[PDB]
Amino acid sequence: ADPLGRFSALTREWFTTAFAAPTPAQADAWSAISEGNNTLVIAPTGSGKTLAAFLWAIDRLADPQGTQVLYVSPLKALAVDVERNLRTPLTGITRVAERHGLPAPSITVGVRSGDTPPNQRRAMIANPPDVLITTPESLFLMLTSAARETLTSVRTVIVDEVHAVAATKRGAHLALSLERLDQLLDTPAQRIGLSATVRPPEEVARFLSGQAPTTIVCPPAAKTFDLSVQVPVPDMANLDNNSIWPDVEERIVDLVEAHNSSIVFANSRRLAERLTSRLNEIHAERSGIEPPLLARAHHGSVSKEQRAQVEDDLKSGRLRAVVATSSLELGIDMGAVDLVIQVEAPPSVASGLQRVGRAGHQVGEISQGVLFPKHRTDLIGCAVTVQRMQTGDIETLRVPANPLDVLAQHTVAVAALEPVDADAWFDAVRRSAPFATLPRSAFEATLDLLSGKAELRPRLVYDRDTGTLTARPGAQRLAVTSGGAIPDRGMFTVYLASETEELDEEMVYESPGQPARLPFWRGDSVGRPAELGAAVGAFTGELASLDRKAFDKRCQKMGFAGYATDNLHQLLREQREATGVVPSDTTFVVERFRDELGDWRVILHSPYGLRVHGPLALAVGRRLRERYGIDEKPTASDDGIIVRLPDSPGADLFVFDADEIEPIVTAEVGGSALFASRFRECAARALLLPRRHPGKRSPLWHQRQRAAQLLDIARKYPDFPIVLEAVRECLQDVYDVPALIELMHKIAQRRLRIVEVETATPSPFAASLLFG
DNA sequence: ACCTGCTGCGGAT
Ligand SMILES: *O[C@@H]1[C@H](O)[C@@H](COP(=O)(O)OP(=O)(O)NP(=O)(O)O)O[C@H]1n1cnc2c(N)ncnc21
Ligand SMILES: [Mg+2]
Prior knowledge:
Elements: H1 9-18, H2 24-34, E1 38-42, H3 49-62, E2 69-72, H4 76-85, H5 87-99, E3 109-112, H6 118-126, E4 131-134, H7 136-143, E5 156-160, H8 163-166, H9 169-182, E6 190-195, H10 201-209, E7 214-217, E8 225-231, H11 245-257, E9 261-265, H12 269-287, E10 295-298, H13 304-315, E11 321-324, E12 337-343, H14 349-356, E13 367-372, H15 376-391, H16 404-414, E14 420-421, H17 422-431, H18 440-451, E15 460-463, E16 468-471, H19 475-480, H20 505-509, H21 530-543, H22 548-556, E17 560-562, H23 564-579, E18 587-594, E19 600-605, H24 610-628, E20 635-637, E21 640-645, H25 658-668, H26 673-685, H27 700-714, H28 721-734, H29 737-748, E22 753-758, H30 764-769
Parallel strand pairs: 1-6, 1-7, 2-4, 2-5, 3-4, 5-6, 8-13, 8-17, 9-11, 9-12, 10-11, 12-13, 18-22
Antiparallel strand pairs: 14-16, 15-16, 18-19, 19-21, 20-21
The structure holds phosphoaminophosphonic acid-adenylate ester and magnesium ion (MG).
The site of magnesium ion has 5 residues, from helix 3.
The chain binds one DNA strand through helix 7, helix 15 and helix 19.
């Protein structure tokens, strides 16, 4: 049993002098990779998955022309960190080679991202590196230019953090780029995927390899986390101060000053800039200084120069704290970071495991992680998150099926340089995972829209007698300036693409002391998943029924600290005192009260996430304007639905038959604000909207105007591929209709209770749903 | 009172 016996003597001798022994994930991965199989490596953050995917390819490059290895990272910071960390093995091979009198190998390593200056991009095409590190977006650019000629020799493709794109149109974008690559090679490259958070393994492996078989490497995972949920104030409902931020910022500086290097994660860029300002202002007042800053920001809007210095000073431990977004969530190996702080509950359990994983990033080390709730109901969010992280209960991922807009974009790009065979392009598309069942009718339908069908611009010419697609002038410049799959989002700061007479684009689509509508806020993308929503209610119900003893025991195995136990107990007690019972996975609560203006307000309490409450609000809305004649559309969130009715009220308003749900949602989604937004993002991603400058993505006000003016014409044609895909994304990717159906099935089974209660003043849970 | 998510981002003249 020798995992290093396969490699040459030099690489074997180096790895022995560098590490005590390979990890199980390395030994298994080297076996599968060396035998030629596509391999998905599933192991915790301290497992050495980088060398698992790289070392065999490195050994072959060391053995006595063109880019040979292609590493793809979803994050730029990780891409640069991999380049720096590959210096240790390459430097070691050289030391060992020369120790034994052999000539040193020359292995080049390059990084191609958006930060690469033009002159360096030209140097990387004239002299391509043996190991190319890049992003999915940039891989798309090289495949849609003369740079692809350097990729004709690629033998290995590493897709790091494959879970981060598997369930998105960004990964479908990546899935097609890789198939376009395989068509540039004599032999499709070997594909290797890495992730500590894979569920289900078989589906992520299907995303990585498409139709090719995948050896799944997933050895027994032992990763120790030291998690903690700290609440600095004794009562979040009655704060001595204007806000909870001052006491939170205090404990963070306390935690940073107590640890060598810490990463503080914020769920937005503005909050990261804010906290960095606060943490420095606190550190200065404590140290009599007006002298390095204690903390510095890292996120997408930071320049590359400042970003580079933050990563370098973090790599060396010079920087004691960095306040980052998800730009540092994955992969980075900062040996000086022994603490990760998460402000607010993270967007998912998997991300919390990835973020906290940055700390203790060595084999066998513990990852220390502290979560700070922002408000009362966020404390439950952080607790459930810590709970699921300790048991590894992450979300189940599902590859979006047949995303036609992603296809249309690649179709312009694959034919931007040459004429492509429609059959061959279809054959390659079906080899990817997201299009394995693509109907040929949908394929030709997409080509028709790109060619011939007038507020849009077609970008290709289709010869059906020959089966050939050719590009119209500027197709390449259109594809390369597209930006990929990530959509242009933006908020109406008052009004842009105005309607005068900050707000969410969807809230805006639904346009002194008089009753007002509550601004609907979609944080970003889909919302809470149904399985995690169930876990939230089961946590709330369980802990709201424990004597203080079992309660305290339960909180301490989550790492509750400060006053987290007091505030959770008080929160559930007060919610119990207000509605008798607390909402849970088995009991929904319908709460009713009258506004100070005399208007009724009926709130549905349920933890099952926005993916279920989104479509449920559509159904309630249809009934409200049909059965009651009220056109005000209800506000939906992760933790329930808010309805407002002028004074004339029941819970049967929310209850529907299981077979009634899916048809209703299908009929209402076409007029909803979500569909208008996702039709715009789809139309732009398909490269069909007219832009203001050929080599520049049109401003958001202009996308909206042209997309809205296009939809008013496309509504007339229900078979329009953009309409089809917009409906496809809303119902399958945003909503979770199967979850909404079984929820109604359970309510019909009398297995999900419902309680009507009238309150004199909003309960704690109702107060939270009202703007906070 | 939390004061309303991120990721990435031309090329050929
Ligand atoms: O060189 C590595 C690094 O310093 C850490 C962890 O290695 P990673 O390659 O970053 O492991 P992961 O990619 O899985 N981390 P994440 O899931 O991306 O977050 O340990 C070093 N290292 C590698 N291999 C070993 C062995 N065998 N022993 C000790 N340290 C090792
Ligand atoms: Mg990794």
